[PDB]
Amino acid sequence: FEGGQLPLFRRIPKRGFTNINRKEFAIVNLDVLNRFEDGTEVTPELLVETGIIRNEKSGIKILSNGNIEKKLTVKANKFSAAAKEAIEAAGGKTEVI
Amino acid sequence: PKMKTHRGSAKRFKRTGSGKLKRRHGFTSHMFANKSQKQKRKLRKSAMVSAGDFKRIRQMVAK
Amino acid sequence: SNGRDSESKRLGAKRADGQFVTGGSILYRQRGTKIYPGTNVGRGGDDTLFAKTDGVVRFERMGRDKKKVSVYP
RNA sequence: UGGGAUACUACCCUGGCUGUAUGACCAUUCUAACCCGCCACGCUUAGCGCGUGGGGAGACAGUGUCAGGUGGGCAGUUUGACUGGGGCGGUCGCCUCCUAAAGAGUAACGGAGGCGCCCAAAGGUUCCCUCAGAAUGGAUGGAAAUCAUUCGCAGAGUGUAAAGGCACAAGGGAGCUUGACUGCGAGACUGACAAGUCGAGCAGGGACGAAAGUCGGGCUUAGUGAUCCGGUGGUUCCGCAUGG
RNA sequence: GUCCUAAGGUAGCGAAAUUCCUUGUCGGGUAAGUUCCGACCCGCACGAAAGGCGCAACGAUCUGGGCACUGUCUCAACGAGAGACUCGGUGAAAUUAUAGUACCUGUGAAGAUGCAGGUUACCCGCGACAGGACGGAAAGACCCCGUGGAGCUUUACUGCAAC
RNA sequence: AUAGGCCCAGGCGACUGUUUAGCAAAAACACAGGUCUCUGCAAAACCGUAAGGUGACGUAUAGGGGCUGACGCCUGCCCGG
RNA sequence: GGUUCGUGGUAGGAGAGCGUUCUAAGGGCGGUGAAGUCAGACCGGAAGGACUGGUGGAGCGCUUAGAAGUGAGAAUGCC
RNA sequence: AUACUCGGGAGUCAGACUGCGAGUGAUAAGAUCCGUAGUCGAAAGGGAAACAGCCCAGACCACCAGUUAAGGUCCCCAAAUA
RNA sequence: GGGUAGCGGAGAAAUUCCAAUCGAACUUGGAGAUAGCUGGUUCUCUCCGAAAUAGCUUUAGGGCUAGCCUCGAGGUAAAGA
RNA sequence: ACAAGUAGUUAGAGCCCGUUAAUGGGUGAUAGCGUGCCUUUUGUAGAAUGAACCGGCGAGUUACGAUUUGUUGCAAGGUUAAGCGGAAAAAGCGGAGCCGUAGCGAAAGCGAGUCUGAAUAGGGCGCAUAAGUAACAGGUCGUAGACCCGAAACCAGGUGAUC
RNA sequence: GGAUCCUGAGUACGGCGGAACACGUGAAAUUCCGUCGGAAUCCGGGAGGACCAUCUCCCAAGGCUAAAUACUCCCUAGUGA
RNA sequence: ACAUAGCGUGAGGAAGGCAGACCCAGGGAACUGAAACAUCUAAGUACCUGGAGGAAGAGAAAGAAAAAUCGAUUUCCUGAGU
């Protein structure tokens, strides 16, 4: 309340809408994949057991942030272009389940 | 009981990564004959909530 | 029947002679050219003088009756 | 005889108007719903009620739902602030000046004025220019019109108040034009916030100019009003199982 | 003449329960009359059923004058009772920061028992009087304020009954 | 001891009545009378959601409502709103 | 532990504490007299705390922590 | 010897007088309204008899010590009948 | 002896009366209504210490942001005086 | 019992005492200085407010959220809720969920970037300059009567015409 | 097995007016009330938030049903920083 | 006229109370909040009335969904102040 001066929130317009079908992915940066042993097949189920992602909202997306050392086989619902390149640049294969 | 979010505010502000509030500008419906194209370009962008205003309203939009 | 006046417009010098300014710094707010745009200084649409480059502000005589403001890097 | 013709003609058609498919619309009559604060009889030792029979009324009235109108009869409320008490009067936003004490800012129901627009050029650019007034001479022609010479820093002009500017003009002509552009924007001013102001420069694509260059309206500073809600145009956005 | 209007106030009455100016003016009444009575009409702003103008009778009605009468008064005196006062019995109340509680002139939140400078003043009571304690009583009813109430009004807004 | 003071003149209200229990008794209200108007009887009007009532066991010489207020003389003009 | 500069204060911010009732644990007092109450010339920088004596006649401190119905001179306060 | 930044917590939005500079007013007001400085507010002490706002000056506590400020030194009344 | 009851009665009308209450009775409840107003708010010492302004406000004796106070933390061509 | 008093205080004889033994106690001739307390105020000794006195009682609390500081545990993680078990225990079990670990965008989406934009431009918000989370305690805020007392009023159901 | 027959009618639903749904008529599905209109009826019908189509899941207009939940005038035994 | 109404007799049953609680239904405020106020809030609350029962209500899909499936209702935690 501003003692009758029109409050800030009414001086400015409402914006946008909420999407009923909004997908939010559980994010996994490369750095945490170094945790795993070399030549290992990283699944969502393996990513929740280990305790890296607890709730797999809409799916698991792999993002680049950090740098991967080990040569893995990572299967996730989505990969960033950079993440895919980086997983491969190390000497691994990405699959999109 | 839980605090209630101010819904008017929740439809107008957006919380940034650093925890500030971003807002739109006012004078951006109608009466556009009365504003310059420079004014229009500027008013079209987003803005941050001022320190003074933020102090007054932050509890209204916690959560 | 009186009782009216407009808001004061805060005209006059905004940077001192000998002060370092960044490009775009308003040097003088004015109606018309009380002071003229010197070297590395522009005159805006409302007659506002602004630095076009970084440097030091210098208010100078133009010749007898007139005055200019320049920005020297 | 005329731009249109006459008859036959067929698509038709205009005023009058008959048959034939509808239809509500009135209008009158009818009785059997409904009604009777009518009579007689019964329940019944009852001026209630109900029943039976007459009479009256009748597709109305009454009653339900829906709709328009009237509607302080009754209800809930609103009916501003400033103010040398309040009321009455005046004022309320914006621009310019003085007050304002040679930065900025600065009050009073202090002193003065303006605004709620205008301009397709009164904008942009290129080129060229110089105003007021007076004196003297001269047809209509007068104190004053249009010529001519001289003197004239501006005594003019600048769409419009005032202040600050402006004669390398920002004033006045002419040619071509639409930068009165789209995306922006280092950085600054102003400022409680909301807003407001200036901006080099970058990109796109232009106008004028031989080029240099200037141009994101107008000499500058008023000419405006948030949000919510609605309308219109666009749209590589969403679309509540899926396609819409 | 002339402008306007739907039409421009008739009779009666009029300085009035109505007249601002105003104690209008004139007359009457009084030694002297802002009131009263009678006239006059320039009716600020009477007027015909929110009736006009009269009017016998009536009125704890209002107004002016007179006679009677009188302590109403000149201007106060005396007497009676009740209370007061003294004694015996009984015995409240409002109020109350503590008080050993003068005056003057000043000062000060601009009106002082209490501050200053002076001036007065032995201690304790009783009968009396009210100048002060901005005395008591009552969170001023006037006045303003409150985005307080309530009652009332209407061609305020929105409604509702009823028709 | 107990038992009207009176007169002249004016305003208002005709009159007897009525009223602010507890600051106003009056010139206020009422009133008889006047006038307008509504009402054909399951009357109009009024109370009630209704039934049921009042009106009225009345019926236009009656009933409801508005205004005026005995009586006398009267009651003008305007229907644009 | 010294040195230097400080230490008026309303609204108000900050800090450290006193005391009250109750709980826990530890350790005590008390019919050879508890609490309360009365008095006093005692102690601490304050809130406060002891001691001695009278009254009283059965309960109460202290330490450390914890929890609060935790402190009154004003409310035309209520009894 | 402070500034600035970011956080937690406020209170304040009746001001007053004095001096100076202005308006309003009558070149009145202990008037009103600004600007500027001070004091009061929230400041005890000394002076101005008394006297928030003037002059001098800032109270941590104790002392029967001292020196000064405004203002004073005949008596009330400390100090010069200098 | 009875009748009329509060969004109501009753009123020869005064806002008049309805249990010493009436411009809308009393009582209980909603109810601890609301009160930008007034009053009040209880132990101690230590350190610091304001404001009575601007802007906007159905705003003017209220509020909000800013200014001025306080506590903590940060950071350096020290930017303050 | 010659005195002018917010009643004390400082100085101080005299008289009277004798202690928690202290540069002690009671009283106070006389002298200096000295306008209660509270509230509210620009300013109150105030001739502004409140209190007769004494005593008792009498006002920021709790719950659930938010936020910030302190503390502790664990830490790129942290933590369980209801519930089961039980003694109105303690553990154990319970990972559903919540917060954090990634942002940008109205959104599709893309992701250490993203949005805007024709842009490989500039600019916004982010990253590069990782710490959170659970619990308790302090401060403040929100919803609740929310520090306490106080209207006039409003509405609902009843009770009253013994006045 | 599927020749035939049955499987809740003034119902469902719709218009109009309201209400309940967190959902204030809204683009308003779903549920109920008043009023008026008014289906299909296994080759059938409903829903998936206007609506149509597809798919999916259901079979209304009949009824009954313990426990886990609420509260305590009571009784018994206990508890309380 | 049959008969119906009516009238009589005999069986069954009801009636009233309350735990100032909880439950379901019919009817349903205002103060208050919105810094005014009318939509909205308070609140389907208070209150009145009826029905109850030891509990009531709900309940065996013309359901929830759309991870591809679940399998009556109720209550708690959560979702989410979304």
Ligand SMILES: [Mg+2]
């Ligand atoms: Mg738009």
Ligand SMILES: [Mg+2]
């Ligand atoms: Mg000004």
Ligand SMILES: [Mg+2]
């Ligand atoms: Mg311009």
Ligand SMILES: [Mg+2]
């Ligand atoms: Mg009304």
Ligand SMILES: [Mg+2]
């Ligand atoms: Mg109301």
Ligand SMILES: [Mg+2]
């Ligand atoms: Mg006013």
Ligand SMILES: [Mg+2]
């Ligand atoms: Mg005055």
Ligand SMILES: [Mg+2]
């Ligand atoms: Mg005045």
Ligand SMILES: [Mg+2]
């Ligand atoms: Mg100046």
Ligand SMILES: [Mg+2]
């Ligand atoms: Mg729209």
Ligand SMILES: [Mg+2]
């Ligand atoms: Mg779809």
Ligand SMILES: [Mg+2]
């Ligand atoms: Mg005479």
Ligand SMILES: [Mg+2]
């Ligand atoms: Mg007439």
Ligand SMILES: [Mg+2]
């Ligand atoms: Mg008449």
Ligand SMILES: [Mg+2]
């Ligand atoms: Mg008459």
Ligand SMILES: [Mg+2]
């Ligand atoms: Mg006489």
